Enzyme design. Structure first.
Site, short mmCIF file in Angstrom:
data_model
loop_
_atom_site.label_atom_id
_atom_site.label_comp_id
_atom_site.label_asym_id
_atom_site.label_seq_id
_atom_site.Cartn_x
_atom_site.Cartn_y
_atom_site.Cartn_z
N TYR A 1 0.46 -14.60 -60.04
CA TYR A 1 -0.10 -13.14 -59.30
C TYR A 1 0.72 -13.00 -58.00
CZ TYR A 1 -2.80 -9.25 -57.66
OH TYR A 1 -3.19 -7.71 -57.18
N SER B 1 0.08 -6.91 -63.30
CA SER B 1 -0.13 -6.03 -61.87
C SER B 1 0.98 -6.50 -60.93
CB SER B 1 -1.52 -5.86 -61.34
OG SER B 1 -1.60 -5.22 -60.46
N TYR B 2 0.69 -6.93 -59.78
CA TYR B 2 1.27 -7.72 -58.91
C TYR B 2 2.14 -8.82 -59.48
CZ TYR B 2 3.60 -8.56 -54.29
OH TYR B 2 4.46 -8.36 -53.03
N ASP C 1 -3.48 4.29 -67.44
CA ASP C 1 -3.58 3.42 -65.99
C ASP C 1 -3.40 4.35 -65.13
OD1 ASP C 1 -3.37 1.56 -64.23
OD2 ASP C 1 -2.26 0.06 -65.37
N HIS D 1 -5.82 0.08 -66.38
CA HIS D 1 -5.41 -0.99 -65.93
C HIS D 1 -5.93 -2.25 -66.43
CE1 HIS D 1 -2.34 -2.96 -63.07
NE2 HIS D 1 -3.26 -3.47 -62.26
#
Ligand SMILES: *[C@@H]1O[C@H](CO)[C@@H](O[C@@H]2O[C@H](CO)[C@@H](O[C@@H]3O[C@H](CO)[C@@H](O)[C@H](O)[C@@H]3O)[C@H](O)[C@H]2NC(C)=O)[C@H](O)[C@H]1NC(C)=O
Ligand SMILES: *[C@@H]1O[C@H](CO)[C@@H](O[C@@H]2O[C@H](CO)[C@@H](O[C@@H]3O[C@H](CO)[C@@H](O)[C@H](O)[C@@H]3O)[C@H](O)[C@H]2NC(C)=O)[C@H](O)[C@H]1NC(C)=O
Ligand SMILES: *[C@@H]1O[C@H](CO[C@H]2O[C@@H](C)[C@@H](O)[C@@H](O)[C@@H]2O)[C@@H](O[C@@H]2O[C@H](CO)[C@@H](O)[C@H](O)[C@H]2NC(C)=O)[C@H](O)[C@H]1NC(C)=O
Ligand SMILES: *[C@@H]1O[C@H](CO)[C@@H](O[C@@H]2O[C@H](CO)[C@@H](O)[C@H](O)[C@H]2NC(C)=O)[C@H](O)[C@H]1NC(C)=O
Ligand SMILES: *[C@@H]1O[C@H](CO)[C@@H](O[C@@H]2O[C@H](CO)[C@@H](O)[C@H](O)[C@H]2NC(C)=O)[C@H](O)[C@H]1NC(C)=O
Ligand SMILES: *[C@@H]1O[C@H](CO)[C@@H](O[C@@H]2O[C@H](CO)[C@@H](O)[C@H](O)[C@H]2NC(C)=O)[C@H](O)[C@H]1NC(C)=O
Ligand SMILES: *[C@@H]1O[C@H](CO)[C@@H](O[C@@H]2O[C@H](CO)[C@@H](O)[C@H](O)[C@H]2NC(C)=O)[C@H](O)[C@H]1NC(C)=O
Ligand SMILES: *[C@@H]1O[C@H](CO)[C@@H](O[C@@H]2O[C@H](CO)[C@@H](O)[C@H](O)[C@H]2NC(C)=O)[C@H](O)[C@H]1NC(C)=O
Ligand SMILES: *[C@@H]1O[C@H](CO)[C@@H](O[C@@H]2O[C@H](CO)[C@@H](O)[C@H](O)[C@H]2NC(C)=O)[C@H](O)[C@H]1NC(C)=O
Ligand SMILES: *[C@@H]1O[C@H](CO[C@H]2O[C@@H](C)[C@@H](O)[C@@H](O)[C@@H]2O)[C@@H](O)[C@H](O)[C@H]1NC(C)=O
Ligand SMILES: *[C@@H]1O[C@H](CO)[C@@H](O)[C@H](O)[C@H]1NC(C)=O
Ligand SMILES: *[C@@H]1O[C@H](CO)[C@@H](O)[C@H](O)[C@H]1NC(C)=O
Ligand SMILES: *[C@@H]1O[C@H](CO)[C@@H](O)[C@H](O)[C@H]1NC(C)=O
Ligand SMILES: *[C@@H]1O[C@H](CO)[C@@H](O)[C@H](O)[C@H]1NC(C)=O
Lengths: 729, 729
Positions: free
Chosen positions: A510, A593-594, A671, A703
């Site tokens: 992450y 995501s990140y 998303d 998402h």
């Protein structure tokens, strides 16, 4: 060993199921708990119960009930149905109120369908709700509403609820309503998105819909026009005496009004005193105002002598936003988590009209949260125990003697239990401890008067027995030393792990600012299957930018996302290779995501370390992500500020280097958070330099790609990809 | 064999190029032809040329010129630049005009930027252009424009240009302007899209664009509100600078006005006579009006005695629309292709005021098109020769004795040349033949009076020499008999084909109504590479619904898309899979557009014949495609008409049957034609039933996926997929 392993179907079908014990305190010594669809009421002291609401009561209600909420005086119950999800916290629903004393649905003056938010007052049975972007108050559940605002307007004016960016990035809630402690006053924020640009995307819906719908949401990308905000307080006690009660505005301080800013915290101190925190759009300067009701004027005045400034020279304010104050009963002082001179977050004690505070904790570890405050004790969670930044315990500090600090959880079951959270009863008379690992979750009940354990609520003995017949993986948590600093990592290791063999390795990433992926929590997840069935080591590393270890580490990426946090994952994979049980030819990376951004940056780095990877719903360019999150770390994308780094930190600029790796790119088309745009631009860049890769879109998924079918589909697809990468049959 | 094969890079980098010879006739004896960016003029009789325009003439022009158009009288040239593509035929551009006599660029009263269509008159040098949805006329290139229409409005009112659906499905052109033969009159259509719903989709653009754009196009899906149409004629010889121009309307016949309809053909017969064909929304009834100018009233009158009705009891009217009439010099009679009493399309001779026509050709074969008409002969292309429906030859029929028909192309070179098209000079004095296969393309010039072969314009001898050096595949064209009917197929066979070996087979499918995938045309394409380098047989089959073989075959799928044409591809493969040289464990299927739908229906059939397949921009459900094409075959999706079959013929209903095949689904995100939606609903259906598959989106690509980089990427991705399926390295 002939036991079965933990398989993908086991994961996807929830074969092995963790039991919880979710209770709701309704007083200082009773809680509600659902058992066999009956709501039971429990006595904390003795553990006996009764039926609060028989599970048959709302047979012939005609609808499925999603959730319920009891008034603080226990006279009424709010029944939620027709639930329709919106973003991460927002939804709409229908509501009925049931009168418990006379055991009857209230059929008159009902809360309207498509209500956006409802909350009881903290005492009694007043209700505030938001419907069509305006606030309404009911003094009695059966009687007519009083309208509070007339300015509400879809996608433009939000009263008492947040817009998209305030919901996701500042309040972590849809609600922007705050009742005073005894319910006299109702405070609220009003957001104006008039000049905020819209993100637009297609939603396809069921097969029967002939033309796709265009979803349009006010969403400020980095550097764009933000929403503006105003703050008001109304006296609800005046409502039945005047036709239209006045909402009194409390304006931001001059130091905020000079430019763009945010409202970031609202906390009531007493019945007639409220605190507000404001943050500059450049998020390194914050101001708390403490405001008192003036009875002779009916106004709210914020004395400058009571204003408190928080700033940072090395980064932004707070972990993700300025911390909340916890006031003493008289409202003349408060406790708040603040970064000390060494950069460690600790509890500071403030008098409201004095600018310098006093630190009451210290050391090279951090306070995670303040959980309860009484006249004699403050209760907080921290990672002090054994110097493990990834462990969590509950502590108690004597307010008359700060040297007296007791750990309430550390030694209860130290082998099984190193990560706790807590739930206190209404006046902190009892507490439920929730242990999340490293062994199976354990839920227990305690009395605060003597800190003795009353009973075990749930111990997961059923699951313990099932898992004994399965070849489960193990988990190591440890650290490596880089440049004289400890950096922590975890590994999910296959059963019968053998250090003299070379295992394929998946780096699970992450790595966003203040993130923590190495910890003591027990999880049954995709990594469990990969390790148990496929004999893959799944590893995670907390490098520069990671949280809960002080500002020297956390602020290392200030104004520089896509640099050290990316490099440090590469180095972690090098370091794991040096440990000698890793097959250098089979190292992969994945993230969401990140973590999708970092994966993508690592795969495009040219390092040669990784054979393949998977990015799910990645950020690809910071100018495409929201203002509040992005600018916190990156400042503004202008030549005068940080445009050069915004432009240097994109995935797309690294496209040529993907010739060296196998990549799978995955994104949901609906998303609203990390826009499909972001992956659409990665794929175009890769096509433009002639790189072959694999892709998967998920129609109408957001998402979380979290519908039951999509969830199963995505993990199935990713498993095939990993197994092929590692030449596993 | 040490020779190289035809590789994927050869296909993608166009290493082996067909030479063409594109000429433009400017009289009965001269044509224009571009040589080294010079424009030369050629005498047809002797083959001498002169330079008409130097390639150095516009060296200092200051923009790259996209195309040019010389005025019929040779005095002006229109220079097209700032080209920006829209749909299949539409685009805007800037224009300058160069005066060839004074060798000067015109600087006054220039054609505006963002012009949507320009055209010279057919004689002389008048111009008509459309800008901002309105029509303008210039009588001389340096004089001010006369504005003809004032109602033009983006996305709403279209004067002189078509909307999306008329462009794609009716006129195959953006222009809706028709000059009279000597330029006196300019006719035009006006489309009104007021209540036509919009398709909306995202366009991402360059990486620099912070927020995606939403593209919105008026597009009527099956059963939705259609555009309406009106028709007008204006006299360009009586335009005034002082008063606005008067357009005369010709209204549609009452049998059309009763309900929804289309204008489907406009053909001038004489200087003062125009023909229009109209088509009901239920496309099995068509009416032709023949309209004469009345000089005393200044109006256009269409006598009911000159009306000609065309209807179909078995299907729709025409191959894709009613055919165009070919008028004689006096305009009192005309020739037109019509389906005869046995369902074969043949040339019929009409008198303008008589109901009954006379067929001048007949037989179990079809006329493809009428190419030229003189007082003595009508020249046409047909597939008569050798009873091969996939060949094409030029014939002439003696108008005074219909038993005298002469084939003009059949015996010129029967082994190399079985597929011709033709281009006649202005009064049919000369013709160019263009042979497209089965050998290398060959372009020759001929004189009509005694059908002399005057010369070879281009014989592709350079490419022939090159290709002798590579191991090229062969092509077999042949037939199978399905209950008493011949159905044709072609196979691209590997070099050194050995009928005692078992080869994998790919079925390349289109199979839309009136399609033909089995023919004698020479192609250098993806199949060439698959056969030559990968040793895959690539086969195609024309079953029920296919064209050029009579209506018993073509109308077999009337009101029933997704039935017989799908079943017939399965049967073909079943037959191929028994022929001796096919590996029944390695049969695949792929197609684009209609071919993607059929591929997907085949894979969802549960037949068990196919291991894998690839669908590119497929239709998935007929309610998502446009009204004009869909309803032509399917009628209307209402309970009273054909809704049950619209609902039975989707890909999504067959999702469960994909569990035993490998499927790759591909679609461009900016497809204005077959909307991305259609694939978005396939993927969701497969996710919902737990079926794994492979996917690829192409950002900002349309239906052609034809940008240089996306083209290379798609064929590369598909090649890897087919090779994996067939276990090929
Ligand atoms: C939300 O914020 C927007 C601004 O982003 C506020 O809209 C602005 O409101 C003012 C005052 O109502 C408008 O000014 C007026 O303009 C008209 C000319 O059209 C003129 O006649 C008046 O004398 C005055 O100048 C302004 O047009 C408008 N601006 C925009 C961008 O819409 C809005 O009032 C805020 N709403 C709330 C509830 O706070
Ligand atoms: C293009 O087609 C549109 C759609 O039919 C035409 O718009 C329509 O125009 C008629 C005549 O002006 C309008 O009639 C009006 O109806 C209203 C009732 O709402 C009534 O109050 C009036 O007496 C009048 O008869 C009709 O409403 C209107 N529909 C629209 C715009 O939605 C339009 O005129 C066409 N344009 C051209 C240039 O041909
Ligand atoms: C092509 O050439 C012709 C003349 O070509 C002559 O060439 C001889 C070898 C032979 O074939 C002979 O029969 C042929 O006539 C050009 O024709 C000329 O055109 C102009 C008109 O502007 C007249 O001035 C001449 O009288 C005329 N000659 C004849 C009798 O035809 C012709 O222009 C040229 N065409 C092109 C495009 O270059
Ligand atoms: C209650 O009071 C508010 C505030 O004065 C009124 O809202 C104003 O209404 C006028 C007239 O419609 C507008 O011009 C103002 O812009 C409004 N201001 C706000 C803050 O909304 C509201 O109309 C009153 N409602 C009743 C029932 O009288
Ligand atoms: C809740 O607190 C409010 C605010 O202090 C109380 O309202 C005030 O009550 C005092 C009486 O002690 C009066 O001086 C004022 O008239 C009230 N002021 C306001 C702002 O209305 C309220 O009564 C408290 N409620 C309860 C149940 O104790
Ligand atoms: C808040 O952050 C901004 C951005 O880093 C700081 O502004 C900088 O101020 C320094 C010193 O005054 C200047 O030299 C720079 O020009 C500014 N930075 C840039 C490049 O934008 C500001 O000082 C910070 N505030 C605090 C409290 O430290
Ligand atoms: C030519 O016809 C048009 C008809 O619309 C006239 O132009 C419009 O005149 C109206 C007044 O009725 C204005 O409202 C518009 O602004 C005009 N033009 C446009 C752009 O719509 C024009 O005046 C006519 N000229 C003559 C000579 O009759
Ligand atoms: C183009 O054809 C038109 C239409 O036949 C011709 O215009 C007519 O010409 C005669 C002159 O001999 C006039 O008496 C008529 O009134 C004209 N008709 C109309 C409608 O204007 C014209 O001669 C031809 N023009 C060219 C370029 O030859
Ligand atoms: C054009 O096609 C329509 C649709 O097939 C035909 O309409 C049908 O005709 C038959 C015979 O009269 C009726 O029994 C059906 O009920 C009709 N309606 C529908 C919706 O099927 C129509 O007859 C065709 N026209 C021609 C010229 O053959
Ligand atoms: C719980 O039981 C309460 C009864 O009080 C006695 O219970 C005995 C078992 C013993 O523990 C004594 O010490 C207690 O005094 C009763 O008052 C509560 O109402 C019960 N609560 C609920 C929710 O059922
Ligand atoms: C309803 O409650 C009773 C508790 O005695 C239980 O027997 C039954 O299983 C419950 N039914 C539901 C809806 O779970
Ligand atoms: C909510 O909607 C339902 C369903 O249409 C309707 O019957 C009911 O009356 C509505 N309730 C309210 C509060 O209007
Ligand atoms: C331009 O024209 C000349 C004239 O014959 C030709 O030979 C030359 O190769 C051409 N080159 C260009 C500029 O394309
Ligand atoms: C087209 O645009 C260019 C650039 O603005 C301008 O110089 C030119 O005058 C325009 N042409 C016409 C004829 O309007």
């Amino acid at each position: 060993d002939s036991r079965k392993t933990y398989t993908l179907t086991d994961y996807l079908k929830n074969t092995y199921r963790l039991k919880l014990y979710s209770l709701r305190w309704i007083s200082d010594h009773e809680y509600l708990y659902k058992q066999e669809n009956n709501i039971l009421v429990f006595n904390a002291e003795y553990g006996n119960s009764s039926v609060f609401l028989e599970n048959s009561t709302f047979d012939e209600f005609g609808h499925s009930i999603n959730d319920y909420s009891i008034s603080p005086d226990g006279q009424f119950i709010l029944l939620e149905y027709n639930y329709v999800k919106q973003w991460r916290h927002s939804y709409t629903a229908s509501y009925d109120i049931y009168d418990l004393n006379k055991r009857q649905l209230i059929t008159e003056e009902r809360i309207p369908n498509n209500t956006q938010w409802v909350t009881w007052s903290p005492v009694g049975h007043k209700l505030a709700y938001v419907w069509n972007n305006d606030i309404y108050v009911k003094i009695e559940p059966n009687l007519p509403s009083y309208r509070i605002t007339w300015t509400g307007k879809e996608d433009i004016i939000y009263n008492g609820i947040t817009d998209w960016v305030y919901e996701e990035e500042v309040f972590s809630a849809y609600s922007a309503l705050w009742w005073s402690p005894n319910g006299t006053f109702l405070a609220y924020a009003q957001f104006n998105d008039t000049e905020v640009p819209l993100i637009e995307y297609s939603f396809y819906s069921d097969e029967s819909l002939q033309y796709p719908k265009t979803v349009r949401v006010p969403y400020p990308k980095a550097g764009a026009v933000n929403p503006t905000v105003k703050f008001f307080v109304v006296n609800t006690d005046s409502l039945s005496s005047v036709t239209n009660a006045t909402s009194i505005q409390i304006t931001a301080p001059a130091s905020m009004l000079i430019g763009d800013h945010y409202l970031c915290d609202v906390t009531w101190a007493t019945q007639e005193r409220i605190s507000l925190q404001w943050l500059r759009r450049i998020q390194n300067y914050s101001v708390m105002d403490i405001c008192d009701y003036d009875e002779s004027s009916g106004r709210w005045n914020c004395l400058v002598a009571r204003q408190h400034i928080e700033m940072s020279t090395t980064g932004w304010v707070g972990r993700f936003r300025p911390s909340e104050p916890h006031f003493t009963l008289d409202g003349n002082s408060f406790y708040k988590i603040i970064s000390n001179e060494e950069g460690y977050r600790h509890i500071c004690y403030f008098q409201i009209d004095k600018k310098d505070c006093t630190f009451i904790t210290k050391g090279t570890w951090e306070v995670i949260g303040i959980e309860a405050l009484t006249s004699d004790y403050l209760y907080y969670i921290s990672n002090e125990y054994k110097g493990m930044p990834g462990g969590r315990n509950l502590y108690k500090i004597q307010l008359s003697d700060y040297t007296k600090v007791t750990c309430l959880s550390c030694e209860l079951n130290p082998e099984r239990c190193q990560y706790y959270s807590v739930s206190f009863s209404k006046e902190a008379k009892y507490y439920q401890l929730r242990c999340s690992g490293p062994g199976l979750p354990l839920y227990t009940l305690h009395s605060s008067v003597n800190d003795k354990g009353l009973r075990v609520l749930e111990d997961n003995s059923a699951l313990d027995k099932m898992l004994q017949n399965v070849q489960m993986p193990s988990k190591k948590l440890d650290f490596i030393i880089l440049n004289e600093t400890k950096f922590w990592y975890q590994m999910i290791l296959p059963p019968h792990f053998d250090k003299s063999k070379k295992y394929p390795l998946l780096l699970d990433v992450y790595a966003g600012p203040c993130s923590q992926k190495a910890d003591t929590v027990f999880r049954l997840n995709w990594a469990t299957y990969l390790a148990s069935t496929e004999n893959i080591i799944v590893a995670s590393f907390d490098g520069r930018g990671s949280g809960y270890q002080g500002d020297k580490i956390m602020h290392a990426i200030n104004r520089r996302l896509g640099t050290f946090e990316v490099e440090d994952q590469i180095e972690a994979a090098r370091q794991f290779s040096k440990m000698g049980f890793v097959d250098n030819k089979r190292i992969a990376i994945w993230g969401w995501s990140y973590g999708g951004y970092v994966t993508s940056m690592v795969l495009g780095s040219g390092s040669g370390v990784f054979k393949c990877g998977i990015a799910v719903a990645p950020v690809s360019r910071w100018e495409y992500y929201d203002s509040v999150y992005t600018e916190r770390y990156m400042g503004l994308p202008t030549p005068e500020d940080n445009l050069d780094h915004y432009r240097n930190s994109t995935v797309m600029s690294r496209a040529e280097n993907f010739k060296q790796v196998e990549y799978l790119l995955i994104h949901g088309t609906a998303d609203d958070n990390v826009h499909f745009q972001q992956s659409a631009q990665i794929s175009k860049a890769l096509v433009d330099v002639g790189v072959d890769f694999q892709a998967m879109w998920y129609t109408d998924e957001d998402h979380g790609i979290a519908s039951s079918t999509a969830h199963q589909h995505i993990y199935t697809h990713m498993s095939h990809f990993i197994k092929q990468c590692f030449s596993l049959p």
